Amino acid sequence: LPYDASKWEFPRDRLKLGKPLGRQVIEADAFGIDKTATCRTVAVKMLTHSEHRALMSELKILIHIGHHLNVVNLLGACTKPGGPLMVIVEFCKFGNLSTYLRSKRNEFVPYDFLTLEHLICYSFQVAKGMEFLASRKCIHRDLAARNILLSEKNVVKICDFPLKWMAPETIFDRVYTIQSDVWSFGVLLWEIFSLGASPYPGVKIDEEFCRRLKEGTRMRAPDYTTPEMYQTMLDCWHGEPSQRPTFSELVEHLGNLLQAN
Numbered sequence: 001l002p003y004d005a006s007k008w009e010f011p012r013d014r015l016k017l018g019k020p021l022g023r024q025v026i027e028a029d030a031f032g033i034d035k036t037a038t039c040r041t042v043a044v045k046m047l048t049h050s051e052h053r054a055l056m057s058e059l060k061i062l063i064h065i066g067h068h069l070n071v072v073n074l075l076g077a078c079t080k081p082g083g084p085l086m087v088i089v090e091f092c093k094f095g096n097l098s099t100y101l102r103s104k105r106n107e108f109v110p111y112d113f114l115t116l117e118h119l120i121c122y123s124f125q126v127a128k129g130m131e132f133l134a135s136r137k138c139i140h141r142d143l144a145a146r147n148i149l150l151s152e153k154n155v156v157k158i159c160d161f162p163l164k165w166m167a168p169e170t171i172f173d174r175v176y177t178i179q180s181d182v183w184s185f186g187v188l189l190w191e192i193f194s195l196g197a198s199p200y201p202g203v204k205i206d207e208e209f210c211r212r213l214k215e216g217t218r219m220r221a222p223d224y225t226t227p228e229m230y231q232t233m234l235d236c237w238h239g240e241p242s243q244r245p246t247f248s249e250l251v252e253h254l255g256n257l258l259q260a261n
C-alpha cells in the first residue's frame with residue numbers, strides 16, 4: 001500500500017525516547033509532531049523480515065483507517081534508512097481502562113470521583129469509535145476494556161493493533177464480523193459497569209461454558225449498572241448476530257442515555 005513520506009515521515013532527531021510502555025513500545029517526547037512549536041509526549045512502536053513486514057502493515061493500516069477522536073491515532077513514522085522503524089501514535093496518560101476503573105473502585109459515586117455520567121460517557125465514546133471503525137470496514141476482534149486507553153479530559157481511545165469476549169458464532173464457527181464485535185462490546189460494557197472486573201467471575205471457561213452460552217446463559221448485572229445499561233448488554237449479547245444492535249444504533253441509544261442522565 002502506498003506510503004506518503006511527505007505526509008507522515010517524522011525526523012528521528014526530534015524524538016527523545018523515554019520510559020518503555022511494553023512489549024517494543026516506549027514513551028517519547030516529540031518536537032513539532034503536530035506542526036506547532038510544541039514538545040508532546042507520544043507513544044512509539046519500534047523494531048526479521050516477518051517482523052518488519054508486520055510493523056509496516058500496521059502503519060499502512062493506521063493510515064488507511066484515518067483519524068477519529070476515539071481511536072489511538074497515527075501521528076507519524078520513521079521509515080527512512082539510517083535508523084530503526086518507528087510508528088508514532090497518541091499517548092494516553094492514564095493507561096488502559098480496565099486497570100484504571102479498578103483503581104477508582106473506592107472513588108465512585110453514582111451521582112475526582114467517577115459517576116454514572118463518566119461510565120456512560122466512556123461507553124458512548126467506544127461505540128462512536130467502533131461505528132467509525134465499521135465505516136472504514138474494519139473488525140476489531142479483541143474489543144475489551146484492556147484495549148481501550150484513557151487520555152486527558154476523559155477521552156477514551158480504542159487500540160487498533162479472550163474467549164470471555166467472543167461471540168458464540170466466533171467460538172463455534174471461527175466467525176469474526178462487526179456483529180461479533182457488538183457482542184464483545186456488551187462484555188466491555190459489563191467491564192465498565194463492574195469497574196474493571198473480569199467477566200464470568202468464578203466460571204471455568206470450558207466446553208460447558210460454551211454450551212450454556214449457545215443455549216442462552218448470560219452474565220448477571222454488574223455492581224454499578226443502571227437497568228438501561230444492563231438491557232443494552234443483553235441486546236449486544238443476542239444469540240442471532242443480526243438481531244444485535246449495530247454500532248450506529250448503540251451510538252444513538254447511548255447518546256440518549258447520556259443526554260438523559
Ligand SMILES: CCS(=O)(=O)c1ccc(OC)c(Nc2ncc(-c3cccc(-c4ccccn4)c3)o2)c1
Pocket residue numbers: 021022023025043045072089090091092093094095096146149
Ligand atoms: C502498555 C500497557 S497499557 O496499554 O495498559 C498502557 C499503560 C500505560 C500507559 O501510559 C502511562 C499507556 N499509554 C499509552 N499510550 C499509547 C499506548 C500504546 C500504543 C501502542 C501500543 C501499546 C501497547 C504496548 C504493549 C502492550 C499493549 N499495548 C500502547 O499506551 C498504556
